[PDB]
């Protein structure tokens, strides 16, 4: 609702804020035959364990000294979570790495 507050952004058309991001997002789906998302599986590296070592080692650049000038201008932590998710679960983790780093930059 662009009101300066995070605490009500999970508002829904029923006028209540869902504490679950899944039920929040489901309440904004435009079509009735779309499946309701039951649970959002954070940290998808469990489904491809081969990817986790690279996902960590590569996305840790966001918290490395190269971004240190930015770390006090924008907090890197959401971008690091997004990066590790992206690299662990996408069609090409190199492109997803570059997209996450570009997103923080």
């Amino acid at each position: 609702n662009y009101n300066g507050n995070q605490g009500d952004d999970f508002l829904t058309p029923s006028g209540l804020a869902e504490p679950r991001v899944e039920d929040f997002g489901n309440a904004w789906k435009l079509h009735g035959d779309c499946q309701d998302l039951q649970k959002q599986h954070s940290d998808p590296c469990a489904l491809n364990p081969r990817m986790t070592r690279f996902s960590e080692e590569a996305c840790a650049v966001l918290t490395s000294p190269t971004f240190e000038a930015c770390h006090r201008a924008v907090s890197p932590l959401p971008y690091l979570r997004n990066c590790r998710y992206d690299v662990c679960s996408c069609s090409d983790g190199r492109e997803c790495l570059c997209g996450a780093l570009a997103s923080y930059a």
Binding site: D33, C34, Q35, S91, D92
Partner: protein, 105 residues
């Protein structure tokens, strides 16, 4: 062009007059086949094409013309679906479908 409209083909261009110097990596042909020049021809191969061999700039025999008009191998062509453009090895799935881009299709 009137000659070609009567089936007579003339090699009339010379370095002294009116060389059809080609864009990008393309090469001149006095007569080349239009039906298989573009990556769209890979993306819509079931569509019939019968247009005559004609003068112009064409990709070398193993390469297809991309959106920006340079010539790429068949594997590097993007794919066209519902009027949207997908890069090689792109995947998508939806409640009705699951599709991927390879060899321009």
């Amino acid at each position: 062009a009137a000659c070609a409209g009567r089936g007579v083909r003339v090699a009339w261009r010379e370095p002294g007059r009116c060389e059809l110097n080609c864009p990008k990596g393309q090469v001149y042909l006095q007569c080349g086949t239009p039906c298989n020049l573009t990556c769209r021809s890979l993306s819509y191969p079931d569509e019939e094409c019968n247009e005559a061999c004609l003068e112009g700039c064409f990709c070398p025999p193993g390469l297809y013309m991309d959106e920006r008009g340079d010539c790429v191998p068949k594997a590097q062509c993007p794919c066209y679906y519902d009027g949207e453009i997908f890069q090689p090895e792109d995947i998508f799935s939806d409640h009705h479908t699951m599709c991927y881009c390879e060899d321009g299709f």
